[PDB]
Amino acid sequence: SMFLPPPECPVFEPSWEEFADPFAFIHKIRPIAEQTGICKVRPPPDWQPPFACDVDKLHFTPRIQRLNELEAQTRVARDYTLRTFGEMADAFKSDYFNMPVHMVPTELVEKEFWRLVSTIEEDVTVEYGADIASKEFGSGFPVRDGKKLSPEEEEYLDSGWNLNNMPVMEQSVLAHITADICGMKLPWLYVGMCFSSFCWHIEDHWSYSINYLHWGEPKTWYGVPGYAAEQLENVMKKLAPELFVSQPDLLHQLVTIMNPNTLMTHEVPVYRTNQCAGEFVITFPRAYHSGFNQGFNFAEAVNFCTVDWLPLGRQCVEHYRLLHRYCVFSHDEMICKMASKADVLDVVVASTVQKDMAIMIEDEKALRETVRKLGVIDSERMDFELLPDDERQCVKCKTTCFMSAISCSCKPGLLVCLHHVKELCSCPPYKYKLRYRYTLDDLYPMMNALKLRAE
Ligand SMILES: O=c1[nH]c(Oc2cnn(Cc3ccccc3)c2)nc2cnccc12
Ligand SMILES: [Mn+2]
Ligand code: NA
Ligand SMILES: [Zn+2]
Ligand SMILES: [Zn+2]
Q1: Can you list the alpha helix ranges (DSSP code H) found in 8-166?
Q2: Among 335, 361, 365, 364, which residue's Cα sits nearest to residue 350?
Q3: What is the CATH number of domain 1-327?
Q4: Is 232:256 a contact under the CB 8 Å cutoff?
Q5: Torsion-angle region of 286 (φ positive above 0: left; ψ -120 to 50: alpha; else: beta)
Q6: 182 CA distance to ligand 4 centroid (A)?
Q7: Can you tell me which atom of ligand 1 is nearest the CA of 63?
Q8: Which of 95, 210, 245, 305 reaches 20 to 30 Å from 226, CA-CA?
């Protein structure tokens, strides 16, 4: 009547044989879970990593949250310990419902959350912990050096599902990246309380994300499959246009809370789940998700990218360009980095990188033919990867340049990508200089190495 819960997302219970490699399993369930955007993974019953940290020595600065639907939100009172936050959180929920925290039905909290964010008369604010591990504060999973060690203990250190490991693993193409992308490579830690929420969003570069709830009360999720992404965006733009006025920066991205029933009304497929302690939630590329916490809990999450994602990664950078959105990293620079490490790549990875590189080269060849016909004649090799990101973003579309860019001595330090040659200045194109990383004759042997590796 007021809230009709979306259908449940897929729940997977793999045997230990299937649970062996995360990426093999993710590839296995992909045809199913990609249709819902999110899926839940219950590990085999005896897979129980030890959570152990001092509640008094762990301290963090909490972010404050107003609970209002369609109200804009962004990033950066009090400094909590994990204990003092927990005492505040437990007290809040206890007072809100006048009940012991574990007698409050999940269905009630869900219904109450959506009633709360709708009503203007209700001005409930909550606090949330959201930060990258930094030994301040460190990961909830076990990490190396300290304690010799036992078989079970040491297993959780090397496990694929240890979220400290999955970034630097072999099929996460993000691991080969040498540029600083700390926000996209290191696990995030979320300390939640009742009604603390995360707004509708997709990951940077449309990456996967995997989320683990270490302990505490459930985390309620809502998910939308990647194919219905622009459906959702169209729906939201008509209801809250102020969120789509393009941001000055990545730190100024606008997001919001929105009732899934509103989405379902406009025929956007939405799915839900209650993630309990010791369970994984996996989000797929361009899959919109949001949710809230049922109570005091502790979650850990990290982004990652499979070889399945490479074409989508390229598509995303193109999409960013049309939106004039900033990139976290250069997609092309990543490809060329892997190509240069062809002899030590996995052979299926090398096969997939070759395919994306083939597209990159052909697109680059066409672009350079176009700018040559515009009158750009002078050219000079340039090692784009040496420049800081802010020193190699296109003046027009803000894309991070790597393969090529146009410069002119009129405006030192400034660059445009080959799509925006007419956007640099008023000088004639013969005054311009084409700055390139590789000649086409350099690129084909690079791709050829990948071909040999893939045998
Ligand atoms: O469980 C999750 N919790 C969560 O917490 C939140 C809420 N806002 N933010 C974003 C944020 C980061 C840093 C400071 C302030 C805000 C993170 N954000 C998430 C994003 N994706 C998937 C799952 C989650
Ligand atoms: Mn997310
Ligand atoms: Na409200
Ligand atoms: Zn551009
Ligand atoms: Zn000029």
Answers
A1: 22-33, 82-97, 106-118, 151-158
A2: 335
A3: 2.60.120.650
A4: no
A5: left
A6: 25
A7: 15
A8: 245
